[PDB]
């Protein structure tokens, strides 16, 4: 943290922070808190853990008058596959947005298993748009997410009455879900694709549906993007 701090306020350069296995650092912090021989709190964790994380995640931000900014994206293992975990509950109200992992998508032999429902970012408003990322970013993101969600609802509905009862939006969401899951979701091990490749693959994959099949799209966007 001090290392990232030196490259921002002093050296003035763009920095990115990444923490791995925060759960082990939490158990370590538990042994360290028990080093004061204090009676532990709920589920064997210090009551000052809120402040312990508050002196950690507060190391990220942009400084006024300084060109160099430091950004942090920590990683933590949720206990026993539970979101009720003290770690998740502590980073939940503190950090902005959360990127989870779907055990279903990891055990199905597919790529990166971030559940589309759970995936969110609070700074997503400032990181997209014309001049930031792309004008096709937010609207198509919401459209693809809605396609995956409605696609899941249709996945359950088709698992009920069958595929003979598939409706227009239902079948459209079925193809959209199958595609988004086996393609959009698929990225790579070392593979890094550009934002332009993301917007293009998004418009192209969402092109499977008609122009009026997406109520999540704006007219100006649809006229200046789809081609």
């Amino acid at each position: 943290l001090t290392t990232a701090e030196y490259l921002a306020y002093q050296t003035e350069r763009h920095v990115l922070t990444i923490l791995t296995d925060m759960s082990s650092y939490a158990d370590a912090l538990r042994e360290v808190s028990a080093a004061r021989e204090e009676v532990p709190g709920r589920r064997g964790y210090p009551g000052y853990m809120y402040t312990d994380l508050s002196t950690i995640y507060e190391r990220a931000g942009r400084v006024e008058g300084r060109n160099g900014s430091i950004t942090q994206i920590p990683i933590l293992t949720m206990p026993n596959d539970d979101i009720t975990h003290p770690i998740p509950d502590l980073t939940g109200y503190i950090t902005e947005g959360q990127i989870f992992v779907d055990r279903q998508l990891h055990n199905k032999g597919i790529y990166p298993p971030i559940n589309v429902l759970p995936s969110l970012s609070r700074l997503m408003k400032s990181a997209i748009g014309e001049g930031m990322t792309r004008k096709d970013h937010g609207d198509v993101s919401n459209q693809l997410y809605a396609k995956y969600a409605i696609g899941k609802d249709a996945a359950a509905m088709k698992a009920v009455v069958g595929e003979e009862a598939l409706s227009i939006e239902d079948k459209l969401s079925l193809e959209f879900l199958e595609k988004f899951e086996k393609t959009f979701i698929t990225q790579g091990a070392y593979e890094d694709r550009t934002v332009f490749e993301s917007l293009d693959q998004a418009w192209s994959l969402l092109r499977i549906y008609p122009k009026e099949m997406l109520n999540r799209i704006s007219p100006k966007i649809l006229d200046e993007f789809y081609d």
């Binding site: 409706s167 227009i168 008609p210 009026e212 099949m213």
Partner: protein
């Protein structure tokens, strides 16, 4: 017409007849697409229509006119199967389904107007009843196309 008459003709040699059917099929392969009639076939197979002047342009209607009825009105049966399936089951009129069923109504209307012998099927396919049941709909456009098809069945009695 030359390939049609030659295919309808006879040949003593096996190679002559086989090459005749192959050449006629080869011609009919890209001839149907000009004016692409297969273009609508993709929409029917995918069961999703759109805004195109396929049934609107009289020329396009004349181009695929001969391909409208093959075996027991196979193309016509495939044409009424989509609307019938959008009738007996599903049949929820909002956005896509409405404009698609309406376009199918106008297209099947131009078809019945073109083919006078195409009526006998609509009664036995339950299409007369679905078309008449399409008289009252949520959208004025769907009701207009359906009433147009109703007057179309009313055109020849």
């Amino acid at each position: 017409p030359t390939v049609q008459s030659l295919s309808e003709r006879k040949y003593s040699d096996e190679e002559l007849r086989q090459d005749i059917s192959n050449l006629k099929e080869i011609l009919e392969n890209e001839y149907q697409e000009l004016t692409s009639f297969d273009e609508y076939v993709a929409e029917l197979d995918s069961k999703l229509l759109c805004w195109s002047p396929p049934h609107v342009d009289n020329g396009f209607w004349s181009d695929n006119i001969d391909e409208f009825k093959k075996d027991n009105y196979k193309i016509f049966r495939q044409l009424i199967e989509l609307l019938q399936a959008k009738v007996r089951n599903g049949d929820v009129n909002a956005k896509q389904e409405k404009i698609i069923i309406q376009v199918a109504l106008n297209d099947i209307t131009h078809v019945v107007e073109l083919l006078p012998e195409s009526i006998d099927v609509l009664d036995k396919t339950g299409g007369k009843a679905d078309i008449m049941e399409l008289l009252n709909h949520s959208d004025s456009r769907v009701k207009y196309e359906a009433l147009k098809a109703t007057q179309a069945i009313i055109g020849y009695t």
